[PDB]
Nanobody
């Protein structure tokens, strides 16, 4: 019942934009850090971005710095990944994750970590 669901994937030309949504259900993400990952074809899972519980800290993989912006809307229980200036190599399945050790949060805190994973939304950049 705790669950993450991604949307916003699409088919776009190089240089275009998308906004991915990571929507929580069965629980509120308000106090949790959220990360985005992707799997490009024939590649290992790549960390894309994360945002801290407060929203005050954000991380980006070097390859997407300046192009992608992560943000959170607690009221909508959703975290967004705005993707501008899309490139061919941004083509991948993208999925989010909530409350994992070292993912824009402490690597070991007191709390048991939720470690929720989503399902995926697909980005194709032609």
């Amino acid at each position: 019942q705790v669950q993450l669901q991604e949307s916003g994937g699409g088919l776009v030309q190089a240089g275009g934009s998308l906004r991915l949504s990571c929507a929580a259900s069965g629980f509120t993400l308000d106090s949790y850090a959220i990360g985005w990952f992707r799997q490009a074809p024939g590649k290992e899972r790549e960390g894309v971005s994360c945002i801290s519980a407060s929203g005050g800290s954000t991380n980006y993989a070097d390859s997407v710095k300046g192009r992608f912006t992560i943000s959170r809307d607690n009221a909508k229980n959703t975290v967004y990944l705005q993707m501008n200036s899309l490139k061919s190599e941004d083509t991948a399945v993208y999925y989010c994750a909530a409350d994992h050790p070292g993912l824009c949060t402490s690597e070991s805190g007191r709390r048991r970590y939720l470690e929720v994973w989503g399902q995926g939304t697909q980005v194709t950049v032609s």
